[PDB]
C-alpha cells in the first residue's frame, strides 16, 4: 500500500560501525533507505562527499534497498524532492534527544507531512561517534574496532597525502 522511502541524513565523516547498524535495522523495516550525505558548504568535514560516499557504499552497498545521495539546502526540501515516508536519526545522549525532538518539531511546521522516526543504537556502538574517531586517527589511535577497514584505510591515505 505504498512502498517506504526513509532518509537518514548525516555528514557521516567519517561513517562508523554505528551508522551501518543503524543503516542495516532501517533497511529491514522499510522498502527504500536512501543514506543522505549533507555536502557541508559552510561546515568543514574531513572527507570529501567522494571519499564519504565511496566509504558509505563500501560497507552498505551489499542491501539492494540502499541509496547513497549527497544533498545540501533544508531536509524539508530535500524530504520532498525524495518524496520521503520519514527521516530517520539515531538518538546516542540526551543532548541528541533534546536537538532532535526541536528539529522535528520546526520540520514539522515547515511541512506538515514531515515525519521524523528514530532508533538508540546497540550498546556496543552507543560509545562511537564520527567527531570522536576523527580524534583518535588524528592523535595517531587505532579505529579499526569502531569503524569499517575502509575507513581504517582513509585515515592512512589522509595521513599519506598530509596530516
Ligand atoms: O553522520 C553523522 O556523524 C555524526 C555522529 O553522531 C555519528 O555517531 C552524526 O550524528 C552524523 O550526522
Ligand atoms: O574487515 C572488516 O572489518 C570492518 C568493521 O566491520 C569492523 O570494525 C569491515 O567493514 C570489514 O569488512
Ligand atoms: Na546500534
Given at each position: 500500500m505504498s512502498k517506504t522511502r526513509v532518509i537518514y541524513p548525516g555528514?557521516?565523516?567519517?561513517?562508523t560501525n554505528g551508522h551501518v547498524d543503524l543503516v542495516t535495522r532501517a533497511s529491514r523495516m522499510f522498502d527504500e533507505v536512501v543514506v543522505a550525505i549533507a555536502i557541508g558548504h559552510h561546515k568543514n568535514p574531513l572527507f570529501s562527499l567522494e571519499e564519504r560516499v565511496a566509504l558509505a557504499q563500501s560497507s552498505l552497498?551489499?542491501?539492494?534497498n540502499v541509496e547513497f545521495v549527497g544533498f545540501d539546502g533544508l531536509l524539508v526540501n530535500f524530504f520532498k524532492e525524495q518524496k520521503a515516508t520519514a527521516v530517520l536519526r539515531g538518538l546516542r545522549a540526551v543532548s541528541d534527544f533534546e536537538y532532535e525532538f526541536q528539529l522535528a518539531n520546526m520540520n514539522r511546521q515547515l511541512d506538515p507531512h514531515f515525519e521524523a522516526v528514530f532508533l538508540t543504537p546497540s550498546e556496543q556502538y552507543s560509545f562511537i561517534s564520527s567527531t570522536l574517531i576523527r580524534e583518535i586517527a588524528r592523535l595517531k589511535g587505532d579505529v579499526t574496532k569502531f569503524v569499517p577497514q575502509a575507513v581504517v584505510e582513509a585515515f592512512e591515505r589522509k595521513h599519506q597525502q598530509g596530516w
Open positions: 555528514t557521516f565523516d567519517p561513517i552497498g551489499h542491501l539492494s
